[PDB]
Amino acid sequence: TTKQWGITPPISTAPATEQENALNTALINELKNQNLFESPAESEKRVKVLDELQQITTEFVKKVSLAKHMNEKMANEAGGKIFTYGSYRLGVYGPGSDIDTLVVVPKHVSRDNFFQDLEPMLREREEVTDLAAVPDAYVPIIKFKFLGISIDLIFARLSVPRVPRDLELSDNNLLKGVEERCVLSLNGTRVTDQILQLVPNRAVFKHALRAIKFWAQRRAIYANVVGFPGGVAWAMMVARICQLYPNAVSSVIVAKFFRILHQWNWPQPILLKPIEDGPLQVRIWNPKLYPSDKAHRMPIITPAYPSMCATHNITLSTQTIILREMVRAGEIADQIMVKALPWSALFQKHDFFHRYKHYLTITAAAKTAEAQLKWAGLVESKLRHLVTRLELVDAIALAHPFNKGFDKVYNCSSEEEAQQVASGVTLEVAYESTDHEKLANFPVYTTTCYIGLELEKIKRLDISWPTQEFYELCKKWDKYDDTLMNVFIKNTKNTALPDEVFEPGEERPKA
Amino acid sequence: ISLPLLKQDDWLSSSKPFGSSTPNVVIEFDSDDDG
């Protein structure tokens, strides 16, 4: 019709039939029955919190500017604006979900002023509790809970001497004079905005992303750190289907989502807009000349400059899992559109611990809980490096990483017994199950991750080389010492799986 | 004077290595003793 969304003409501009619109009402009703819509009183609280954090940013930049001997007029008009991105700005977020915030300041407020001046401004503010402002080891990030609302603040330094109260990060010229670390930060909110503008109907895009993100979480194909696409990645995938069906309702989008994507001839990338060149001369994802961007299995390119592949972590094994989970979800999507299945049938839990014969048990142990959290985060981060080395053997045809990890606390008696727990030997020892840090500032805390295996297939298999590389890769961490932390890998058959991986009532594999 | 607590502090500040590692090995492509 009179509208052309996306980089290709749509598949069908047809309106929604009475059945499609009725199924859409059933889809939204099912999403509400899972408490995926938060509450009107809680969203009003997030708005008052963000406006409260915006008043602090003006107070923050004004104090740092006066310390640089700025005039009464310049320090007043220096400004400083806070932005948001991620699940919150897309409008798709459940209760308790964190608000991915981002602070923008002029260049005269350095990253040193971000941790030295803003952190005390938050504690003295009587509404901030559990503030864990970690000095930058990766990206300048600060986590806290303003009025109970969890916030993840990311620093960004602009070269422009003043940031007005009504600034928009759409102009590509603002990236000039900004360090590469602070450029990728701004790219988070630039892509979140570009997504909401390249879709025909925004309301249809939000309901569809709710069901697709929920389905991905319920099947453990949502974690980015292990090789599965992230939230922004899934948002761009449902955005592309919304473009091809402009006047369709959310139920139609979800049903057509699984079919179109698993039959998509990869690695033909998904683009929400034609890739635009910019001022800075940096890589802009061209698989024809860059061999690194060519090897991307399922490329999903962000529409904001510079255009990067959000799904570059995807390996051969993760790709096969995503394609197979899309095929199953599609068949369910086809039978719910004919009223042969309820919408709740799509959000069924995964069956990871019943799909493979051999599971690779990967645990990380430490003496204290503070060290355990830091150590468990790094071992999980290096998990995608292990499946890539396990794919090279191809006596293993598939190395499926698992989403989360199981935390158990051992209460050892003797010092010689804790050294066994810290190793592959696990006797009959008491293991309490926990989630996170305790005490609020001989026990051995562990965190177990799994990797499913499908074997290609003579008499035995030796994965000693990838496991040894994984050991050195985790112990190369600069914040590590073998006096407190350790990591080991073990084998586990179907029958040898622990009781923790099964919820009450499940049938363990008896083979 | 708390002897159990002193042994805990000695356990935290212990400079001895925490555990060890071993190479892994999976047995059979499972043509015998199938599921």
Author numbering:
A (entry chain A): 11 to 451, 477 to 492, 498 to 551
B (entry chain C): 288 to 322
From the article:
The S. pombe orthologue of the human PAXT connection, Mtl1-Red1 Core (MTREC), is an eleven-subunit complex that targets cryptic unstable transcripts (CUTs) to the nuclear RNA exosome for degradation. It encompasses the canonical poly(A) polymerase Pla1, responsible for polyadenylation of nascent RNA transcripts as part of the cleavage and polyadenylation factor (CPF/CPSF). We report crystal structures of Pla1 in its apo form and in complex with Red1. Taken together, our data reveal the molecular details of recruitment of Pla1 by Red1 which leads to hyperadenylation of CUTs, serving as a signal for exosome-mediated target degradation.
To understand the molecular details of the Red1-Pla1 interaction, we determined the crystal structure of the complex. Co-crystals of the complex appeared within three weeks and diffracted to 2.81 Å resolution. The asymmetric unit contains two molecules of the Pla1-Red1 heterodimer which exhibit small differences between them, as indicated by a root mean square deviation (RMSD) of 0.96 Å. Our crystal structure of the Pla1-Red1 complex shows that Red1 contacts the C-terminal RRM domain of Pla1. The interaction between Pla1 and Red1 buries a total solvent accessible area of 1338.5 Å2. The interaction interface of Red1 can be largely divided into two regions. The first half comprises a short α-helix at the N-terminus (α0) that helps orient Red1 onto Pla1. A network of aromatic stacking interactions occurs between Pla1RRM Phe468 and Red1 Trp298 and Phe305. The second half of Red1 is largely involved in mainchain-sidechain interactions between Red1 residues Gly306, Ser308, Asn311 and Val312 that pack against Pla1 residues Gln420, Val518, Ile520 and Asn522. In addition to these, the Red1 C-terminus, spanning residues 323–345, is flexible and therefore not observed in the crystal structure of the complex.
